[PDB]
Design a protein around this ligand. Structure first.
Ligand code: PCW
Ligand code: PCW
Ligand code: PCW
Ligand code: PCW
Ligand code: PCW
Ligand code: PCW
Ligand code: PCW
Ligand code: PCW
Ligand code: 17F
Ligand code: 17F
Ligand code: 17F
Ligand code: GNP
Lengths: 198, 185, 73, 198
């Protein structure tokens, strides 16, 4: 309601801002004119300075690039050749190493896997009997536990009857007057709050 | 690659620093080393098995520090080093036993009684008296001398064997026997 | 009054800070006990979590509070 | 009142639960014993058979492992020799490359750096002149910038004071009845808050 009075001061604030938006911004533009003029005194020389330097720079760089490229060509080629022969020697080494070791590894695998074929096979079979006996134990006690659980579930359901019936009715018998009392407190609160929030 | 934590406790003057340094670089000291918290780690072959031993040599003049209590818990085996020429040390052995019992939260902890300076002419603690005390605790007694290097390595070897003994026993005690498992530990 | 210096052997040692001896002297007992020499070893200070290069010639007096880590070069 | 009766039902449940857990833990343990006893008997054969068979298992594996290690070490010698002799050539030939190609690198680096010296020196010197021009403009423009900024700041301060006092006093003057009316509503609303929750 009184916001009009407060906002009126905001309008005055806008006016004060507009006063600055004029000469201050205009002055800023005048400063910008100095900035642009300055840049036209800096960049004018800078750009030419760059051009007059980039040319010999790229030229000197080209010289260095040439030195590097030529030098590298006279290095990469012979080195690659030597590395190739060295790699071929390494390859031959690898071949002459991985071949006997490969055959050996295959026999190693034979001696290991065939061993496993005669180690894990009876092991799994033994485990099968062991697991079977264990399964029977789990089924014996499990089947019993199922009966026990069913009995306990029955006891639990029976002990739940005294909760889902009398206790639930008791809760309902409590909820009725409670909700009523809550309603009285809520209704009054609604009116009371509305009266002060109007 | 098996590393064991050995804590050497004892009164100031017994020469804990000397004992440890003698095993590490094999050099006897001559000055009073103001040891507070210094560890020494070396690798040796004990009974055919290679083991890394990290010995913690702490101050023997501390009252009751929380930092001490904490680092005492990280020690597996404990060496009770006392001087055979110092009656106070022989009586203070019980103090070490109780301190370790509390920090480890167990009474059955691998410990070894070490009687250093047995080469000295001065002797107030007889071998039987010390051995009897050790026997009462259920631990072995080793007479040593850092000056003559006698029993030095032996004491350490014994401690490692006690640690092994305890761990082996617990592993073959009764896991499938259902011997104290619980749920909240 | 006590500072713990880290050793390159993955350990540490607590020494007493004195207003006289230098780093070289204080770290001498630490290196000599590990079989090391102050020729190939360098000590690093603890400032802002990161380590800082320090000299042996420098005294151990202003080393009261922080900890040091010795490395081998 | 509600909590008293509701919690009563809780205790009337905990009791039943305890009366249930009693036989339950026993029945569970009885079944557990049967299982664990069987597991023990089974584990007796399990561990024994595993250990009795682990002996020839380890013996078989270690036997082959011996061959594996022996042949490995047997071949490791000539293989290491191939690596050593081969590397001797590879490294030697490379060292014979790092020497001339290294000298060439240094010689090329000489021209590389020397050409850079004859370029970077005047480049940086002329850059000093360029930077001088930049700094000159930045100083001259800066002097104006600061003068204008001071002017703009003064203009800002003028409108600032016109708001820090008149507008602020308007706000503060309004805040008086506003805060008071708010206090009136807050204090009155506080009645309901207490008369509804106690
Ligand atoms: C020019 C230079 C040439 C030199 C030649 C040398 C050749 C080197 C070649 C191979 C080395 C294989 C390394 C085997 C790793 C296990 C080592 C081992 O036995 O150590 C023992 C530890 C024991 O326990 P602990 O010490 O921790 O406990 C105690 C803790 N204490 C001490 C604090 C108390 O055992 C452990 O740590 C068990 C954990 C094992 C995990 C290893 C991680 C390996 C990482 C990466 C492998 C790369 C994969 C890349 C894919 C390649 C595709 C082709
Ligand atoms: C988000 C991604 C999903 C995947 C999640 C992970 C999968 C689950 C599997 C494995 C994680 C297991 C967590 C354990 C981690 C290690 C914690 C640790 O570092 O452990 C070591 C500490 C050592 O002891 P210390 O050094 O302090 O003492 C020594 C001092 N002294 C002797 C001197 C006085 O061990 C202790 O502290 C001992 C206590 C810690 C043991 C806790 C095990 C509890 C087991 C069962 C409880 C189940 C209840 C079920 C009911 C349901 C409720 C909702
Ligand atoms: C939420 C739903 C989950 C569903 C999953 C169900 C399956 C889980 C059931 C069983 C598997 C668990 C097996 C491993 C148990 C270890 C638990 C563990 O690490 O807990 C940590 C606590 C820590 O406290 P602390 O006492 O160590 O520390 C105080 C130290 N102070 C005394 C030394 C100085 O450790 C302790 O409580 C001590 C360790 C207890 C020793 C157990 C031995 C187990 C061995 C064999 C199992 C046998 C099976 C039967 C045979 C069948 C063969 C087929
Ligand atoms: C990313 C790799 C690139 C991929 C390329 C493929 C090729 C990989 C093949 C070969 C690479 C060989 C690398 C050799 C590694 C060196 C490890 C080592 O020696 O490094 C040194 C650090 C030093 O620290 P310091 O305290 O000793 O020195 C303090 C002492 N100063 C002050 C005195 C000097 O030592 C340490 O960091 C302690 C030991 C290292 C522990 C690493 C633990 C890593 C974590 C987990 C492993 C995950 C296994 C996953 C398996 C999954 C199965 C499903
Ligand atoms: C992406 C846009 C970002 C743009 C903003 C730029 C700012 C970020 C850049 C740089 C920040 C520099 C901060 C370095 C200061 C560390 C000081 C320090 O030392 O303070 C201590 C901590 C704790 O260690 P400490 O004291 O035990 O060890 C030191 C061992 N002493 C104490 C014995 C000597 O030091 C540490 O936490 C050491 C740090 C290791 C933590 C690694 C965590 C990596 C995980 C996530 C980061 C994700 C990066 C994503 C990549 C995207 C790039 C675009
Ligand atoms: C153009 C050509 C110009 C010429 C210049 C050369 C080229 C540029 C080259 C490199 C730039 C990298 C700058 C260096 C970075 C530091 C990394 C680092 O090592 O740091 C760690 C340090 C603290 O460790 P310390 O070892 O010194 O202290 C320990 C004390 N002692 C010494 C006693 C041991 O950290 C500190 O000092 C604190 C640093 C915190 C990092 C703040 C960066 C935040 C970045 C972005 C904020 C986002 C803005 C929003 C973006 C929107 C744009 C529109
Ligand atoms: C065709 C091409 C193939 C080439 C031909 C074949 C020939 C080349 C032959 C061999 C290559 C060298 C690799 C073997 C090096 C093993 C060093 C090592 O372990 O020897 C063992 C010694 C012994 O142990 P201990 O008695 O001291 O401990 C005792 C424990 N105590 C603390 C408890 C008391 O240990 C020591 O001497 C301490 C270990 C420090 C030495 C580390 C050297 C590692 C090797 C190479 C460095 C490479 C760095 C990679 C650079 C790449 C950057 C991107
Ligand atoms: C280049 C851009 C063009 C500018 C155009 C607009 C302005 C034109 C109009 C009037 C000129 C006024 C400019 C004068 C500003 C002075 C800044 C300055 O020199 O300040 C320094 C002070 C000193 O305190 P200290 O930190 O050194 O000491 C901390 C103390 N201890 C040391 C113990 C560490 O610092 C302080 O007063 C800290 C407070 C900083 C206040 C900044 C407010 C700036 C106002 C307007 C800019 C517009 C932002 C618009 C955002 C729109 C985004 C879309
Ligand atoms: C006494 C009790 C005390 C107990 C108090 C308990 C605390 C309760 C607290 C909060 C309750 C609020 C609980 C809000 C729950 C959220 C309800 C909800 O989902 O709302 C959604 C709406 C969305 O509107 P939009 O429909 O226009 O559509 C979405 C959007 N534009 C689009 O394009 O997608 O948003 C709106 O509500 C806007 C509707 C505006 C209409 C009204 C417009 C207002 C009209 C008139 C104002 C009165 C006039 C006064 C003038 C007199 C001056 C003198
Ligand atoms: C629109 C514009 C928006 C702009 C937004 C800008 C955002 C800028 C954000 C961040 C700026 C970077 C600010 C970097 C600050 C770096 C602070 C730092 O290096 O602290 C060091 C300390 C180390 O204490 P110590 O006691 O260990 O060391 C000795 C002590 N300092 C001494 O001098 O004697 O560390 C500690 O305090 C202990 C805690 C260690 C755990 C943490 C370790 C990690 C520490 C630092 C990492 C900083 C991470 C920064 C990444 C931020 C990205 C989300
Ligand atoms: C980070 C990746 C992590 C993943 C790792 C995966 C594999 C891990 C396994 C094995 C590999 C091990 C990889 C280890 C990586 C780092 C290991 C490491 O932390 O080493 C220590 C050193 C320095 O230690 P200090 O104790 O001396 O210093 C104190 C320390 N910073 C501190 O805060 O306390 O720090 C440094 O590395 C020195 C940095 C110097 C800055 C210059 C840096 C220079 C950078 C770039 C140069 C490029 C130039 C190319 C030129 C062109 C060629 C012609
Ligand atoms: N005769 C003899 N002297 C020893 C023996 N052990 C140490 N000493 C001597 O006792 C002095 C201090 O030894 P030290 O090992 O530093 O004692 P510590 O009790 O471990 N020091 P701290 O109490 O400060 O931790 C040295 O002069 C040293 O030579 C020993 O077994 N026999």
């Amino acid at each position: 309601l009184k916001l009009l009075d407060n906002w009126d001061s905001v309008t005055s604030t806008f006016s004060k801002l507009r006063e600055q938006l004029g000469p201050v911004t205009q002055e800023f533009w005048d400063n910008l004119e100095k900035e642009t003029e300055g840049l036209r005194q800096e960049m004018s020389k800078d750009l030419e300075e760059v051009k007059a330097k980039v040319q010999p720079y790229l030229d000197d760089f080209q010289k260095k690039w040439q030195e590097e490229m030529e030098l590298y060509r006279q290095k990469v080629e012979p080195l690659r050749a030597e590395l190739q022969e060295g790699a071929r020697q390494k390859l031959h080494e690898l071949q002459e190493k991985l071949s006997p070791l490969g055959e050996e590894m295959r026999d190693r695998a034979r001696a290991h896997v065939d061993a496993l074929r005669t180690h894990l096979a009876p092991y799994s079979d033994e485990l099968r009997q062991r697991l079977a006996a264990r399964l029977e134990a789990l089924k014996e006690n499990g089947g019993a536990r199922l009966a026990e659980y069913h009995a306990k579930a029955t006891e639990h359901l029976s002990t739940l009857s005294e909760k889902a019936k009398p206790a639930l009715e008791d809760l309902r018998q409590g909820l009725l007057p409670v909700l009523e009392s809550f309603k009285v407190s809520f209704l009054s609160a609604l009116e009371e709050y509305t009266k002060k929030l109007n | 690659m098996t590393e064991y934590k050995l804590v050497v406790v004892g009164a100031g003057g017994v020469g804990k620093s000397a004992l440890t340094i003698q095993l590490i670089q094999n050099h006897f000291v001559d000055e009073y080393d103001p040891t507070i918290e210094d560890s020494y780690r070396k690798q040796v072959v004990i009974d055919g098995e290679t083991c890394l031993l990290d010995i913690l040599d702490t101050a023997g003049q501390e009252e009751y520090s929380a930092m001490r209590d904490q680092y005492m818990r990280t020690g597996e085996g404990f060496l009770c080093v006392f001087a055979i020429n110092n009656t106070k040390s022989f009586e203070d052995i019980h103090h070490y036993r109780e301190q370790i019992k509390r920090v480890k939260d167990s009474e059955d902890v691998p410990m070894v009684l070490v009687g250093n300076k047995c080469d000295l002419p001065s002797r107030t603690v007889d071998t039987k008296q010390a051995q009897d005390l050790a026997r009462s605790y259920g631990i072995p007694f080793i007479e040593t001398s850092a000056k003559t290097r006698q029993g030095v390595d032996d004491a350490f070897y014994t401690l490692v064997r006690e640690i092994r003994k305890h761990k082996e026993k617990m592993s073959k005690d009764g896991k499938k026997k259902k011997k104290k498992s619980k749920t909240k530990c | 009054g006590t500072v713990k210096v880290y050793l390159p052997n993955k350990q540490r040692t607590v020494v007493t800070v004195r207003d006289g001896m230098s780093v070289y002297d204080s770290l001498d007992k630490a290196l000599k006990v590990r079989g090391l020499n102050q020729d190939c070893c360098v000590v690093y200070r603890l400032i802002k979590g990161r380590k800082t290069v320090t000299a042996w010639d420098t005294a151990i007096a202003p080393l009261d509070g922080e900890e040091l880590i010795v490395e081998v070069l």
